[PDB]
Design a protein around this motif. Structure first.
Motif, PDB file in Angstrom:
ATOM      1  N   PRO A  48     -16.276  42.811 -15.763  1.00 26.94           N
ATOM      2  CA  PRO A  48     -15.907  43.880 -14.813  1.00 26.94           C
ATOM      3  C   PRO A  48     -16.857  45.077 -14.751  1.00 26.94           C
ATOM      4  N   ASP A  49     -17.625  45.316 -15.807  1.00 23.12           N
ATOM      5  CA  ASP A  49     -18.556  46.440 -15.804  1.00 23.12           C
ATOM      6  C   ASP A  49     -19.804  46.223 -14.938  1.00 23.12           C
ATOM      7  N   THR A  50     -20.193  44.964 -14.735  1.00 22.40           N
ATOM      8  CA  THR A  50     -21.392  44.628 -13.956  1.00 22.40           C
ATOM      9  C   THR A  50     -21.127  43.634 -12.831  1.00 22.40           C
ATOM     10  N   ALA A  51     -19.963  42.981 -12.884  1.00 19.45           N
ATOM     11  CA  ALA A  51     -19.588  41.869 -11.995  1.00 19.45           C
ATOM     12  C   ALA A  51     -20.415  40.595 -12.219  1.00 19.45           C
ATOM     13  N   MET A  52     -21.166  40.556 -13.322  1.00 13.59           N
ATOM     14  CA  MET A  52     -21.961  39.377 -13.671  1.00 13.59           C
ATOM     15  C   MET A  52     -21.081  38.329 -14.350  1.00 13.59           C
ATOM     16  N   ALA A  53     -21.266  37.069 -13.975  1.00 11.55           N
ATOM     17  CA  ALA A  53     -20.529  35.980 -14.614  1.00 11.55           C
ATOM     18  C   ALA A  53     -20.900  35.831 -16.096  1.00 11.55           C
ATOM     19  N   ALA A  54     -19.881  35.652 -16.929  1.00 13.91           N
ATOM     20  CA  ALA A  54     -20.092  35.168 -18.288  1.00 13.91           C
ATOM     21  C   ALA A  54     -20.702  33.771 -18.153  1.00 13.91           C
ATOM     22  N   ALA A  55     -21.840  33.553 -18.808  1.00 15.15           N
ATOM     23  CA  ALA A  55     -22.584  32.307 -18.645  1.00 15.15           C
ATOM     24  C   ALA A  55     -23.471  32.007 -19.849  1.00 15.15           C
ATOM     25  N   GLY A  56     -23.576  30.724 -20.185  1.00 17.28           N
ATOM     26  CA  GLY A  56     -24.469  30.248 -21.232  1.00 17.28           C
ATOM     27  C   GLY A  56     -24.152  30.794 -22.613  1.00 17.28           C
ATOM     28  N   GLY A  57     -22.877  30.750 -22.993  1.00 16.86           N
ATOM     29  CA  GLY A  57     -22.487  31.200 -24.315  1.00 16.86           C
ATOM     30  C   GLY A  57     -20.995  31.192 -24.567  1.00 16.86           C
ATOM     31  N   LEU A  58     -20.625  31.525 -25.801  1.00 18.11           N
ATOM     32  CA  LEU A  58     -19.233  31.768 -26.153  1.00 18.11           C
ATOM     33  C   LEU A  58     -18.933  33.234 -25.907  1.00 18.11           C
ATOM     34  N   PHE A  59     -17.801  33.501 -25.268  1.00  9.73           N
ATOM     35  CA  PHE A  59     -17.381  34.870 -24.974  1.00  9.73           C
ATOM     36  C   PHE A  59     -15.946  35.029 -25.457  1.00  9.73           C
ATOM     37  N   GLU A  60     -15.639  36.172 -26.065  1.00 10.10           N
ATOM     38  CA  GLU A  60     -14.274  36.448 -26.487  1.00 10.10           C
ATOM     39  C   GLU A  60     -13.655  37.386 -25.466  1.00 10.10           C
ATOM     40  N   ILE A  61     -12.748  36.838 -24.668  1.00 10.06           N
ATOM     41  CA  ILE A  61     -12.097  37.594 -23.609  1.00 10.06           C
ATOM     42  C   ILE A  61     -10.645  37.784 -24.004  1.00 10.06           C
ATOM     43  N   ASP A  62     -10.263  39.051 -24.166  1.00  9.78           N
ATOM     44  CA  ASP A  62      -8.909  39.425 -24.556  1.00  9.78           C
ATOM     45  C   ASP A  62      -8.476  38.631 -25.788  1.00  9.78           C
ATOM     46  N   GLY A  63      -9.363  38.578 -26.787  1.00 12.13           N
ATOM     47  CA  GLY A  63      -9.078  37.950 -28.073  1.00 12.13           C
ATOM     48  C   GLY A  63      -9.130  36.427 -28.142  1.00 12.13           C
ATOM     49  N   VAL A  64      -9.609  35.789 -27.074  1.00 13.11           N
ATOM     50  CA  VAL A  64      -9.700  34.326 -27.021  1.00 13.11           C
ATOM     51  C   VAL A  64     -11.139  33.907 -26.740  1.00 13.11           C
ATOM     52  N   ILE A  65     -11.653  32.969 -27.533  1.00 10.08           N
ATOM     53  CA  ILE A  65     -13.008  32.458 -27.337  1.00 10.08           C
ATOM     54  C   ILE A  65     -13.045  31.316 -26.317  1.00 10.08           C
ATOM     55  N   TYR A  66     -13.927  31.452 -25.327  1.00 11.34           N
ATOM     56  CA  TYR A  66     -14.178  30.399 -24.344  1.00 11.34           C
ATOM     57  C   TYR A  66     -15.667  30.110 -24.322  1.00 11.34           C
ATOM     58  N   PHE A  67     -16.032  28.886 -23.943  1.00 14.04           N
ATOM     59  CA  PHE A  67     -17.427  28.568 -23.662  1.00 14.04           C
ATOM     60  C   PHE A  67     -17.665  28.608 -22.158  1.00 14.04           C
ATOM     61  N   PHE A  68     -18.764  29.237 -21.745  1.00  9.75           N
ATOM     62  CA  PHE A  68     -19.178  29.240 -20.339  1.00  9.75           C
ATOM     63  C   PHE A  68     -20.529  28.563 -20.211  1.00  9.75           C
ATOM     64  N   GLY A  69     -20.619  27.600 -19.295  1.00 10.14           N
ATOM     65  CA  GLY A  69     -21.869  26.922 -19.016  1.00 10.14           C
ATOM     66  C   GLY A  69     -22.848  27.866 -18.361  1.00 10.14           C
ATOM     67  N   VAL A  70     -24.106  27.446 -18.260  1.00  9.08           N
ATOM     68  CA  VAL A  70     -25.134  28.313 -17.666  1.00  9.08           C
ATOM     69  C   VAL A  70     -24.840  28.618 -16.191  1.00  9.08           C
ATOM     70  N   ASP A  71     -24.013  27.781 -15.566  1.00 10.64           N
ATOM     71  CA  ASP A  71     -23.600  27.995 -14.173  1.00 10.64           C
ATOM     72  C   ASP A  71     -22.396  28.934 -14.082  1.00 10.64           C
ATOM     73  N   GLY A  72     -21.933  29.393 -15.243  1.00 11.68           N
ATOM     74  CA  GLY A  72     -20.816  30.314 -15.321  1.00 11.68           C
ATOM     75  C   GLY A  72     -19.434  29.694 -15.345  1.00 11.68           C
ATOM     76  N   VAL A  73     -19.349  28.365 -15.284  1.00 15.21           N
ATOM     77  CA  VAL A  73     -18.048  27.698 -15.287  1.00 15.21           C
ATOM     78  C   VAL A  73     -17.462  27.661 -16.702  1.00 15.21           C
ATOM     79  N   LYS A  74     -16.229  28.146 -16.839  1.00 15.97           N
ATOM     80  CA  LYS A  74     -15.508  28.071 -18.102  1.00 15.97           C
ATOM     81  C   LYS A  74     -15.197  26.616 -18.435  1.00 15.97           C
ATOM     82  N   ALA A  75     -15.603  26.191 -19.628  1.00 17.65           N
ATOM     83  CA  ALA A  75     -15.285  24.852 -20.116  1.00 17.65           C
ATOM     84  C   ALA A  75     -13.773  24.690 -20.274  1.00 17.65           C
ATOM     85  N   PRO A  76     -13.223  23.630 -19.683  1.00 19.59           N
ATOM     86  CA  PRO A  76     -11.799  23.299 -19.836  1.00 19.59           C
ATOM     87  C   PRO A  76     -11.439  22.970 -21.285  1.00 19.59           C
ATOM     88  N   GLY A  77     -10.206  23.287 -21.669  1.00 17.98           N
ATOM     89  CA  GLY A  77      -9.715  23.033 -23.013  1.00 17.98           C
ATOM     90  C   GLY A  77      -8.370  23.688 -23.262  1.00 17.98           C
TER      91      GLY A  77
END
Length: 125
Positions: A96-125
């Motif tokens: 929300p601070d930049t409007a840039m997609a989380a991409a190419g890494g693990l991100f902890e959003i609201d206390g939960v870790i997700y993986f985002f591909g380089v295309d910005g798609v959240k890995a299902p799980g």
């Protein structure tokens, strides 16, 4: 969302000139995705929409944008979306601070870790 008005006179920050929006840094107009009063606007390369000039904010509706290695998505209001979004059945998180997609890494959003591909798609799980 918040915006701090560039009230001070001169070529700096968000400026309206002849009913068009520009974003100034170093006294010069910039291309990029920057905060305006009603959302992040796309200050775009010339002729991206209807012969706009370099740095003019444009209509850019329901489209992804790749710019300088960052990924954005713009709603029907031509403002970059933020937070969790589902587009063509894929989930994205736009920081929300930049409007840039989380991409190419693990991100902890609201206390939960997700993986985002380089295309910005959240890995299902």
């Amino acid at each position: 969302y918040y915006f701090e008005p560039n009230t001070a006179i001169g070529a700096n920050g968000y400026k309206i000139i002849d009913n068009k929006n520009f974003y100034f840094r170093n006294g010069l107009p910039q291309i990029g995705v920057f905060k305006g009063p009603n959302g992040f606007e796309y200050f775009a390369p010339a002729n991206t929409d209807a012969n706009n000039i370099e740095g003019q904010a444009i209509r850019y509706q329901n489209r992804f944008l790749h710019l300088l290695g960052n990924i954005y998505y713009f709603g029907n209001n031509s403002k970059a979306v933020t937070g969790w979004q589902t587009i063509n059945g894929n989930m994205y998180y736009f920081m929300p601070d930049t409007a840039m997609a989380a991409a190419g890494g693990l991100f902890e959003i609201d206390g939960v870790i997700y993986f985002f591909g380089v295309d910005g798609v959240k890995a299902p799980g």
